Swiss-Prot record:
Gene: TG
Lineage, top ranks: Eukaryota, Metazoa, Chordata, Craniata, Vertebrata
Pathological association: Thyroid dyshormonogenesis 3: A disorder due to thyroid dyshormonogenesis, causing large goiters of elastic and soft consistency in the majority of patients. Although the degree of thyroid dysfunction varies considerably among patients with defective thyroglobulin synthesis, patients usually have a relatively high serum free triiodothyronine (T3) concentration with disproportionately low free tetraiodothyronine (T4) level. Autoimmune thyroid disease 3: A complex autoimmune disorder comprising two related diseases affecting the thyroid: Graves disease and Hashimoto thyroiditis. In both disorders, thyroid-reactive T-cells are formed and infiltrate the thyroid gland. In Graves disease, the majority of the T-cells undergo a Th2 differentiation and activate B-cells to produce antibodies against the TSH receptor, which stimulate the thyroid and cause clinical hyperthyroidism.
Name of the protein in question: Thyroglobulin
Tissue expression notes: Specifically expressed in the thyroid gland.
Residues shown, of full length: 750 to 898 of 2768
Domain called Thyroglobulin type-1: residue spans: 1-119
Length: 119
């Protein structure tokens, strides 16, 4: 866990299609904050460093995934096999595994932000 969250995550943000946003901040993406909100909503007592451990764990087989955490599936069943497909204008939750390289999809970066950043 050599990454501190709020320290040096830039993620250059621009307000619309082609023009750079006039103010550039130095915080993590708001999708990561929403993922942290969902993780805390699953069970209390969750902090930053156990979240780093929990993403370090459950990343051993890549999908042969794991139960005991519901985030996008509203049909609780251990036998559910559906193809992964990205949807326009949504936070990426299900189809990714994040252990493998590639490219981001749909270019849905221009969203709002928090306050506690170096801008």
């Amino acid at each position: 866990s050599m990454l501190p969250t709020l320290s040096d995550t830039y993620i250059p943000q621009c307000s619309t299609d082609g023009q750079w946003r006039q103010v550039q901040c130095n915080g993590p993406p708001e999708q990561v904050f929403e993922l942290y909100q969902r993780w805390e909503a699953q069970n209390k007592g969750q902090d930053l460093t156990p979240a780093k451990l929990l993403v370090k764990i459950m990343s051993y087989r890549e999908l042969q995934d794991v139960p005991l955490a519901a985030l996008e599936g509203k049909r609780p069943q251990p036998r559910e096999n559906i193809l992964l497909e990205p949807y326009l204008f949504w936070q990426i939750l299900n189809g990714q595994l994040s252990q493998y390289p590639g490219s981001y999809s749909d270019f849905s970066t221009p969203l709002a932000h928090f306050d506690l950043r170096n801008c």
